[PDB]
Design a protein around this ligand. Structure first.
Ligand code: B12
Ligand code: NA
Ligand code: NA
Ligand SMILES: [O-]
Length: 343
């Protein structure tokens, strides 16, 4: 079930979200307690006697609640952090009752913001857990983050590729008014979006035909709401640590991949292979930092039909530990420096 000493500094627990497979209704949530050295592979269903659903796509801890965005079940599952017990299942539906298909969540003050493939952002109150307001953005909204009092939302248009084609913009929402103020042109099929230093926002663009590998990283200046830099590096997903990005790209035709350390100030590669100890990853499926230790966490999805792994590296590219067979297509790892009250 693991290799290496399962250890983290400054961290009580980790949560690993697994999306399962599209239309197979088999998402799952694992919890690892560093404090108790205990892994629970089915943390949501063990405590709630039902499954998370189909294509669980994002997870975050905010305040003292865990939020899981479940894309195809079209819900936001809100969970009490101390107990692991469901507080509310928030159905995300269009005015006609159809699925919005939510994707990602971000937070500011006492509000949560969920973007959805129907082209909307919903504001939820973190106390009442009611949906308060809906605003339209661009097409097939994919990811969302907060910077400088504003929301930034990638309008992928990914589901539209065969119709009008993919979309090409990041929507900007003023949080105070909750109104869309601008659509910034960034390039085709925007995806993962993250805030960085000095009011920056970084977004991946995946091209008009995602399979072809026309991938870029784009930097937006949130002071002027305009593109500052377009890099040439092929980037499919990334994580930010100050002026350094830890990133990967994947070739859906050849199945080759690369995981790299990248200098965001220079636009040049620091290390062509992030991993320095020979550890092999076949299908990198997520990348993120543990904010309490600085370690790099990458998930492994294999051929998408067998359970994947979570790998923990230091910034020097040395594997600290891995947890294997954690869930089907693990896509997000989040961390708590406070222990829950659940064994
Ligand atoms: C690999 C993959 C792809 C590959 C597939 C081909 C390849 N070269 O490998 C590529 C990169 C082309 C791809 C593209 C897209 N897909 Co895709 N991707 C997947 C992934 C990771 C695994 C699919 C797989 O191999 N599965 C297991 C095999 C054994 O089962 P399968 O039924 O044979 O799988 C087939 C379908 O998944 C199909 N497929 C792949 N993507 C999509 C998307 C849609 C909308 C449909 C109808 C079918 C489809 O291709 C697979 C092989 O034929 C899943 C993850 C998941 N399932 O949770 C998503 C997932 C199915 N993909 C998704 C998305 C969003 C996309 C894109 C819109 C991405 C984008 N452009 O922004 C496009 C749309 C299709 C297109 N061709 O343009 C979403 C669909 C969610 C939704 N509500 O519609 C999922 C669930 C990912 C997620 N959200 O977590 N994808
Ligand atoms: Na579960
Ligand atoms: Na469809
Ligand atoms: O995908």
């Amino acid at each position: 079930e693991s290799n290496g000493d399962v250890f983290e500094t400054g961290t009580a627990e980790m949560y690993i979200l697994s999306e399962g497979l599209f239309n197979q209704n088999n998402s799952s949530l694992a919890r690892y307690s560093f404090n108790r050295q205990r892994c629970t592979n089915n943390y949501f269903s063990a405590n709630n006697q039902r499954g998370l659903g189909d294509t669980a796509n994002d997870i975050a801890i905010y305040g003292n609640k865990i939020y899981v965005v479940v894309n195809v079940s079209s819900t936001v599952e809100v969970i009490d952090f101390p107990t692991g017990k469901s507080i509310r299942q928030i159905s995300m539906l269009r005015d006609n009752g159809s699925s919005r298909q939510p994707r990602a969540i971000a937070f500011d003050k006492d509000k949560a913001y969920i973007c959805s493939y129907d082209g909307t952002v919903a504001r939820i109150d973190t106390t009442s857990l009611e949906i308060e307001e809906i605003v339209t953005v661009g097409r097939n909204a994919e990811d969302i983050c907060v910077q400088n009092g504003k929301l930034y939302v990638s309008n992928s248009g990914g589901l539209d590729y065969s119709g009008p084609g993919v979309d090409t913009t990041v929507s900007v929402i003023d949080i105070t008014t909750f109104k869309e103020t601008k659509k910034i042109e960034v390039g085709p099929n925007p995806g993962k979006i993250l805030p960085g230093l000095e009011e920056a926002v970084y977004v991946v663009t995946r091209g008009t035909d995602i399979e072809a590998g026309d991938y870029h990283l784009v930097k937006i200046d949130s002071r002027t709401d305009a593109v500052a830099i377009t890099y040439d590096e092929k980037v499919l997903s990334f994580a930010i640590d100050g002026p350094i990005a830890y990133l990967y790209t994947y070739d859906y035709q050849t199945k080759d991949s690369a995981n790299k350390v990248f200098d965001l100030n220079a636009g040049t590669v620091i290390r062509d292979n992030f991993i320095t100890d020979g550890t092999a990853i076949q299908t990198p499926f997520s990348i993120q930092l543990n904010p309490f230790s600085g370690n790099i966490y990458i998930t492994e999805a294999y051929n998408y039909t067998v359970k994947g792994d979570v790998l923990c590296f230091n910034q020097q590219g040395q594997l600290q530990y891995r947890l294997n067979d954690i869930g089907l297509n693990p896509n997000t790892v989040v961390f708590s420096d406070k222990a829950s009250q659940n064994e």
